[PDB]
Amino acid sequence: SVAEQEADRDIIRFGEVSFSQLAEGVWMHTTYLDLMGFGPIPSNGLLVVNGDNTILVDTAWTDEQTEQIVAWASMVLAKPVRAAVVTHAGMAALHGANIATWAHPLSNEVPARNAITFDANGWATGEAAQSLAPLRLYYPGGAHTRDNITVGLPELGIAFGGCMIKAGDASNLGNLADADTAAYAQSVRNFAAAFPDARTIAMSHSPPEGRKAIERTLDLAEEL
Amino acid sequence: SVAEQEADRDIIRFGEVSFSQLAEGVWMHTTYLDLMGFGPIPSNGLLVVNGDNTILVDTAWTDEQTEQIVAWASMVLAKPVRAAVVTHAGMAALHGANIATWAHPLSNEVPARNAITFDANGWATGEAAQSLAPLRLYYPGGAHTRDNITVGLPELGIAFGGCMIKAGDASNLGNLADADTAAYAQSVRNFAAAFPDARTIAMSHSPPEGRKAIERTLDLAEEL
Ligand SMILES: [Ca+2]
Ligand SMILES: [Ca+2]
Ligand SMILES: [Ca+2]
Ligand SMILES: [Ca+2]
Ligand SMILES: [Ca+2]
Ligand SMILES: [Ca+2]
Ligand SMILES: [Cl-]
Ligand SMILES: [Cl-]
Ligand SMILES: [Cl-]
Ligand SMILES: [Cl-]
Ligand SMILES: [Cl-]
Ligand SMILES: [Cl-]
Ligand SMILES: [Cl-]
Ligand SMILES: [Cl-]
């Protein structure tokens, strides 16, 4: 249940969206999907303050939920979303709101409008790096998908692993139908080394925890 | 725990193997693996009496466990295993025991010694059909793997779905890293139509139940 899943934490509710604060100016948005009736599954992303605007990491499950995140930033925070980045292939809602959207260039080969320039070490450069700061964008290699990316806030000790990172007590890596199974373990090692000091690890389908999420994900990936 | 998993049923223990009777002359063998310490996971197969011998469906997790199944048939039942069929790509133990082993011809492209001849409707013919009777061998198409097969005992109302069929309360299809995701739903429909009357559905990683296992697996496969 949603109530059981949120009993741990201090959650602010806005429509169907659950907001929780990871750090000053760093919001996690959580929404739920129960499509076949099997139980609500969370999807998490971030809303990060920069000056008088916010930067969005990932959409919610639905257009209507994504519209609520945009409205919370504009109406409540009074810091409208000006840019968004998705970590894997809701988008229509962002474009309806004239939000500049960013993705890995090969993801979804509705696309994001802007393709991130990644250097050969996996770090974003150019307009993506300027526009999404203070987020640091990192491409670790193929894992859950070929083109999955990650983001970090090194000054606040937060790293977001998207769909690549699973919970510290996970027993499997979920759906590997699109996965690069041979590369997965090294990509997790690359992520861990890109954000080596962060003690708050956030991810797409489990609540935030510590670096045990990286350790367990790596162990599972090494068995593929 | 193994005890919690077997609390429902009447289990006979032989070494590491749990045996349960699905029908007169039809044994299910269950063994457990807890490789990374996350909890014991069952693997199920069948041991089917034919006259003064038995036919084995699938190995256990390990060579040592598979040796125990062979010993139970020879020592306890006094009906030694004379043939075996595997439903997806322990084998060394069967060959050490001089057991004739059968598999889909394209599986594992240690191989089974004998390749099943399947007709264009998916039914085994030839030596496989003679040697593994009363089991009826059926290739439904790609699903959990490209070459997964299934077996049935239509006169006893039992069908065994291997790794393709999941539990009636499952919320996912497990590991799809090798799956034919586009074909999965039709292959499940093919299996259901091949064994249309069986009310006991057995499978590789969950205990036997009714046709809800087919219904749920099909629903999950239709979402791929
Ligand atoms: Ca709306
Ligand atoms: Ca600029
Ligand atoms: Ca390991
Ligand atoms: Ca032994
Ligand atoms: Ca013969
Ligand atoms: Ca359906
Ligand atoms: Cl992607
Ligand atoms: Cl470069
Ligand atoms: Cl896994
Ligand atoms: Cl860091
Ligand atoms: Cl196979
Ligand atoms: Cl034919
Ligand atoms: Cl699934
Ligand atoms: Cl039948």
Q: What is the residue-wise DSSP string for B102-127? A: EE-TTTT----SEEPEE-TTSBEEHH
Would the CB atoms of A38 and B223 count as touching at under 8 Å?
Answer: no
Token match 């300027």: residue? Answer: A130
> Quick one: residue A161, left, alpha or beta (phi over 0 = left, psi -120 to 50 = alpha)?
alpha
Distance, CA of A155 to CA of B120 (rounded, Å): 63
Distance, CA of A157 to CA of A10 (rounded, Å): 20
Contact in structure between A26 and A46 (CB atoms under 8 Å) = yes
Whole-number Cα distances in Å, A145 to A140, A151, A167, B206? 11, 16, 18, 29
Which residues of B carry a binding-site annotation? 64, 67, 88, 127, 130, 144, 163, 178, 205, 219, 222
Q: CA A97, A110, A60: angle at the middle one, nearest 5?
A: 60
Structure tokens at B57: 């469906």
Q: Which residues on B lie below 8 Å from A175 (Cβ)?
A: 172, 176
Helix (H) or strand (E) holding A222: helix A212-222
For residue B130, count CB atoms less than 10 angstroms from its CB and return exposed for 0-12, middle for 13-18, buried for 19 or more.
Answer: exposed
Token match 């040697």: residue? Answer: B131
Contact in structure between A155 and A136 (CB atoms under 8 Å) = no
Selection from B128, B137, B218, B133 nearest residue B173 by Cα: B218
Distance, CA of A192 to CA of A119 (rounded, Å): 18
Residue B28: beta bridge partners? B20, B46
Contact in structure between B218 and A36 (CB atoms under 8 Å) = no
Q: Which residues on B lie below 8 Å from A33 (Cβ)?
A: none
Question: What are the residue boundaries of the structural domains of chain A, listed by start?
Answer: 1-224
The DSSP annotation for chain B comes to -HHHHHTTS--EEETTEEEEEEETTEEEEEEEE-SSSS--EEEEEEEEEETTEEEEES--SSHHHHHHHHHIIIIISS--EEEEE-S---HHHHHHTT-EEEE-TTTT----SEEPEE-TTSBEEHHHHHHHTTSEEE---SSSSTT--EEEEGGGTEEE-TTT---TT-SS----TT--TTTHHHHHHHHHHHS-S--EEE-SSS--B-THHHHHHHHHHHT-
Would the CB atoms of B224 and A177 count as touching at under 8 Å?
Answer: yes
Q: Is A108 helix (H, G, I), strand (E, B) or coil?
A: coil
Would the CB atoms of A223 and B39 count as touching at under 8 Å?
Answer: no
Q: Which residues on B lie below 8 Å from A220 (Cβ)?
A: 36
Structure tokens at A143: 């894992």
- Å from B175 to nearest chain A CA? 6
- Å from A174 to nearest chain B CA? 7
Helix (H) or strand (E) holding A27: strand A26-33
- Gyration radius of chain A's alpha carbons: 16
Experimental resolution (Å):
1.5
Contact in structure between A169 and A150 (CB atoms under 8 Å) = no
Residue B18: beta bridge partners? B13, B30
**Phi, psi dihedral angles at B20 (to 5 degrees):** -140, 150
Distance, CA of A23 to CA of B152 (rounded, Å): 58
**Phi, psi dihedral angles at A153 (to 5 degrees):** -125, 80
Q: Which residues on B lie below 8 Å from A219 (Cβ)?
A: 36
CATH class of the structural domain B1-224 = alpha beta
Q: Is A164 helix (H, G, I), strand (E, B) or coil?
A: coil
Q: Which ligand lies nearest to the CA atom of residue A69 in the structure?
A: 1
Distance, CA of A30 to CA of A22 (rounded, Å): 12
Q: Strand order of the sheet with strand B41-50?
A: B12-14, B17-23, B26-33, B41-50, B53-57, B81-85, B100-103, B114-115
Whole-number Cα distances in Å, A160 to A15, A104, B170, B190? 24, 16, 29, 42
Structure tokens at B173: 């299809």
Nearest residue, CB atoms, A175 vs list B35, B38, B172: B172
For residue B128, count CB atoms less than 10 angstroms from its CB and return exposed for 0-12, middle for 13-18, buried for 19 or more.
Answer: buried
DSSP A145: S
Which residues of B carry a binding-site annotation for Zn(2+)? 88, 144, 163, 178, 205
Distance, CA of A90 to CA of A98 (rounded, Å): 13
Residue A124: beta bridge partners? A118
- Å from B176 to nearest chain A CA? 5
Q: Is A74 helix (H, G, I), strand (E, B) or coil?
A: helix
Whole-number Cα distances in Å, B222 to A33, A90, B170, B186, B199? 17, 23, 14, 9, 22
DSSP A187: H
Q: Which residues on A lie below 8 Å from B36 (Cβ)?
A: 219-220, 223
Ligand 8 centroid vs A118 CA: distance in angstroms?
Answer: 7
Would the CB atoms of A175 and B176 count as touching at under 8 Å?
Answer: yes
